[PDB]
Design an enzyme around this catalytic site. Sequence first.
Site, PDB file in Angstrom:
ATOM      1  N   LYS B 160       0.825  -1.204   0.000  1.00 54.87           N
ATOM      2  CA  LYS B 160       0.000   0.000   0.000  1.00 54.87           C
ATOM      3  C   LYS B 160       0.861   1.256   0.000  1.00 54.87           C
ATOM      4  O   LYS B 160       0.640   2.174  -0.795  1.00 54.87           O
ATOM      5  CB  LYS B 160      -0.927   0.000   1.212  1.00 54.87           C
ATOM      6  CG  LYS B 160      -1.925  -1.133   1.240  1.00 54.87           C
ATOM      7  CD  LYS B 160      -2.839  -1.036   2.447  1.00 54.87           C
ATOM      8  CE  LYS B 160      -2.078  -1.104   3.759  1.00 54.87           C
ATOM      9  NZ  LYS B 160      -1.131  -2.245   3.819  1.00 54.87           N
ATOM     10  N   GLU B 186       0.823   5.617  11.024  1.00 60.95           N
ATOM     11  CA  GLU B 186       1.775   4.791  10.296  1.00 60.95           C
ATOM     12  C   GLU B 186       3.168   4.978  10.883  1.00 60.95           C
ATOM     13  O   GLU B 186       3.362   5.712  11.853  1.00 60.95           O
ATOM     14  CB  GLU B 186       1.747   5.126   8.801  1.00 60.95           C
ATOM     15  CG  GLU B 186       0.546   4.552   8.070  1.00 60.95           C
ATOM     16  CD  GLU B 186       0.351   3.067   8.328  1.00 60.95           C
ATOM     17  OE1 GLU B 186       1.338   2.309   8.230  1.00 60.95           O
ATOM     18  OE2 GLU B 186      -0.786   2.657   8.634  1.00 60.95           O
ATOM     19  N   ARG B 187       4.142   4.287  10.298  1.00 58.79           N
ATOM     20  CA  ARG B 187       5.499   4.328  10.820  1.00 58.79           C
ATOM     21  C   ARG B 187       6.045   5.746  10.767  1.00 58.79           C
ATOM     22  O   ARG B 187       5.890   6.447   9.765  1.00 58.79           O
ATOM     23  CB  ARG B 187       6.402   3.392  10.022  1.00 58.79           C
ATOM     24  CG  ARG B 187       5.962   1.951  10.011  1.00 58.79           C
ATOM     25  CD  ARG B 187       6.804   1.156   9.042  1.00 58.79           C
ATOM     26  NE  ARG B 187       6.487  -0.265   9.063  1.00 58.79           N
ATOM     27  CZ  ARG B 187       5.553  -0.840   8.318  1.00 58.79           C
ATOM     28  NH1 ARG B 187       4.799  -0.140   7.489  1.00 58.79           N
ATOM     29  NH2 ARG B 187       5.370  -2.152   8.410  1.00 58.79           N
TER      30      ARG B 187
HETATM   31  N1  LIG Z   1       6.547  -2.628  -6.318  1.00 54.36           N
HETATM   32  C1  LIG Z   1       7.303  -3.322  -5.464  1.00 54.36           C
HETATM   33  N2  LIG Z   1       8.431  -3.900  -5.927  1.00 54.36           N
HETATM   34  C2  LIG Z   1       9.193  -4.594  -5.080  1.00 54.36           C
HETATM   35  N3  LIG Z   1       9.005  -4.817  -3.779  1.00 54.36           N
HETATM   36  C3  LIG Z   1       7.885  -4.233  -3.346  1.00 54.36           C
HETATM   37  C4  LIG Z   1       6.996  -3.487  -4.100  1.00 54.36           C
HETATM   38  N4  LIG Z   1       5.945  -3.038  -3.316  1.00 54.36           N
HETATM   39  C5  LIG Z   1       6.219  -3.516  -2.128  1.00 54.36           C
HETATM   40  N5  LIG Z   1       7.373  -4.251  -2.073  1.00 54.36           N
HETATM   41  C6  LIG Z   1       7.947  -4.905  -0.906  1.00 54.36           C
HETATM   42  O1  LIG Z   1       6.914  -4.991   0.065  1.00 54.36           O
HETATM   43  C7  LIG Z   1       7.302  -4.294   1.266  1.00 54.36           C
HETATM   44  C8  LIG Z   1       6.052  -3.693   1.850  1.00 54.36           C
HETATM   45  O2  LIG Z   1       5.641  -2.569   1.044  1.00 54.36           O
HETATM   46  P1  LIG Z   1       4.755  -1.411   1.643  1.00 54.36           P
HETATM   47  O3  LIG Z   1       5.458  -0.833   2.863  1.00 54.36           O
HETATM   48  O4  LIG Z   1       4.400  -0.443   0.590  1.00 54.36           O
HETATM   49  O5  LIG Z   1       3.492  -2.183   2.162  1.00 54.36           O
HETATM   50  P2  LIG Z   1       2.183  -1.838   2.996  1.00 54.36           P
HETATM   51  O6  LIG Z   1       0.999  -2.520   2.462  1.00 54.36           O
HETATM   52  O7  LIG Z   1       2.092  -0.323   3.089  1.00 54.36           O
HETATM   53  O8  LIG Z   1       2.568  -2.365   4.420  1.00 54.36           O
HETATM   54  P3  LIG Z   1       2.165  -2.161   5.943  1.00 54.36           P
HETATM   55  O9  LIG Z   1       0.892  -2.868   6.245  1.00 54.36           O
HETATM   56  O10 LIG Z   1       3.368  -2.676   6.724  1.00 54.36           O
HETATM   57  O11 LIG Z   1       2.070  -0.653   6.117  1.00 54.36           O
HETATM   58  C9  LIG Z   1       8.237  -3.230   0.720  1.00 54.36           C
HETATM   59  O12 LIG Z   1       9.132  -2.903   1.774  1.00 54.36           O
HETATM   60  C10 LIG Z   1       9.048  -4.045  -0.280  1.00 54.36           C
HETATM   61  O13 LIG Z   1       9.817  -4.959   0.487  1.00 54.36           O
HETATM   62 MG   LIG Z   2       2.421   1.021   4.770  1.00 52.63          MG
END
Ligand SMILES: Nc1ncnc2c1ncn2[C@@H]1O[C@H](COP(=O)(O)OP(=O)(O)OP(=O)(O)O)[C@@H](O)[C@H]1O
Ligand SMILES: [Mg+2]
Lengths: 50, 469, 40
Positions: B160, B186-187
């Site tokens: 996300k 968030e972080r």
């Molecule tokens: N487009 C991408 N290409 C490569 N790796 C990716 C990509 N999107 C996400 N990742 C991997 O997934 C991890 C999590 O991504 P992100 O922090 O955007 O997730 P999130 O859904 O916001 O997570 P959370 O619930 O922890 O907030 C990233 O640190 C990276 O390791």
């Molecule tokens: Mg996130």
Amino acid sequence: RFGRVLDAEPRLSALLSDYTTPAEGRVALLDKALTGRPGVNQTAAALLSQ
Amino acid sequence: KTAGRVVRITGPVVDVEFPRGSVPELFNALHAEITFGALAKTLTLEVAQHLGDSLVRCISMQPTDGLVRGVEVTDTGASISVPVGDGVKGHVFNALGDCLDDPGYGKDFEHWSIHRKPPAFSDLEPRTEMLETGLKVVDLLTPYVRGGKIALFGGAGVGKTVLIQEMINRIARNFGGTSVFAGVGERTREGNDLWVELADANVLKDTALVFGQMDEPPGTRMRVALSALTMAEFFRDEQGQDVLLFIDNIFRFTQAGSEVSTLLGRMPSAVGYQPTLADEMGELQERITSTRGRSITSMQAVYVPADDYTDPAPATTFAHLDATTELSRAVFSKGIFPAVDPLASSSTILDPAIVGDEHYRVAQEVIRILQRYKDLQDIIAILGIDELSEEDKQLVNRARRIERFLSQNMMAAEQFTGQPGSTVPLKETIEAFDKLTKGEFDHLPEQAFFLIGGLDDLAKKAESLGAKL
Amino acid sequence: TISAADIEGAIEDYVSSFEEIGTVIDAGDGIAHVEGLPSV
Ligand SMILES: Nc1ncnc2c1ncn2[C@@H]1O[C@H](COP(=O)(O)OP(=O)(O)OP(=O)(O)O)[C@@H](O)[C@H]1O
Ligand SMILES: [Mg+2]
């Protein structure tokens, strides 16, 4: 009139409106503040104090 | 005088007794003082309920540790207000309007209350202008709306935030208007990373950042969204400037609301959520909206707890959106980025009236192929592909290639893989997926379609693998 | 007939006329309830 003045001073009523302190103390406070005045009717004074 | 006194403290929630006739109005800000050494501070309490007997229940914005019963509480006479104007751009604020990157900045600005009614219904006008992002999956299956509301749903760690960064790069970078980012529960290091990245990209001068992050009391985490939305509302309604509003994460606003409701003594709803969940969410969301002649493109990341898409929070959030990208754990597991579930995502403007007949036809054919593949997963998990009919085998090969081709090397993914991102024009996307759905690339290996841009990238990768396009 | 200042002259005198030890009032399952300690 006593009701009106108590209404004007809500904080005085709140201070008087606690039974966590001895009754004699709050009666004395009432006498000093409101009831113990030159024109206060004796019967009204006693009634309010009790 | 007329100041109240603290009577009860239950974590962030505080009960305050005022003299009769001086009971503060709902949502008024009140100030208390914590005098203990390391925790000395001034508490801002937002009035939340009138309990009777001149008592008010209030939600503290800062931790109440060290607060004593009976301390004087002063009524500011108004609600929490935040600075507004062109001055907010380029600076970082907290939920209360304090500037973080430069304390004291913005104290002289015009201040707007963070509580206001949504726009009148008569001023609402539906928005249907497509917003081209350059992402194949988004542009094809879930076309975003300019001036509309977009959401990115997903469980823990499905991408996300990376997709929010991608959309900041693809939309806010070359944007003539203003941008407002609201970090909501968030972080904190993610907020620092965003600050530094925006400074490096020179987008920070056009962006206002408001952060209430994980290590904040639930009151701050449920009011920071209002603060950022107030800055966005000022830009929309006073300067007539197109506004971008990124929010991450709005589920954290709902979660903080649930915590507060628990502290406020309200009887819990299903799954322990606050009874006013839908009402709070609607009150927040209806403010995030374009009006006639005034555009707000808002993009909100929505966390899905325990990957449960039926959780009440996202379930109620779904109704407030024009476009909904759904990130899936399974797609993420396959390595497909962005891990978009093409069957669960949707867009209100994906109809032949708006996006044209060919765009709609290609999108519908892709969706049909992927739906048939999803149906056949039950057979394939046991017996593999070889028990299917020739038609179904061909469809399954086509579907696997399509689902790989919906992935893309994102701009924000370079930091992870080191590979620069790609932008695919919408016309090229439609042409390419039309060719896929017709089986013009069936001979190419599946990995040829993985994490690439347009058809030129497809040719180059297929050649590097060994097949010629 | 009401000064509105003698009120202060009496209430301040009253209030001025007023270590902290609390008492366990009930206890169960790792929780205790204490009466007193107004300054805690
Ligand atoms: N487009 C991408 N290409 C490569 N790796 C990716 C990509 N999107 C996400 N990742 C991997 O997934 C991890 C999590 O991504 P992100 O922090 O955007 O997730 P999130 O859904 O916001 O997570 P959370 O619930 O922890 O907030 C990233 O640190 C990276 O390791
Ligand atoms: Mg996130």
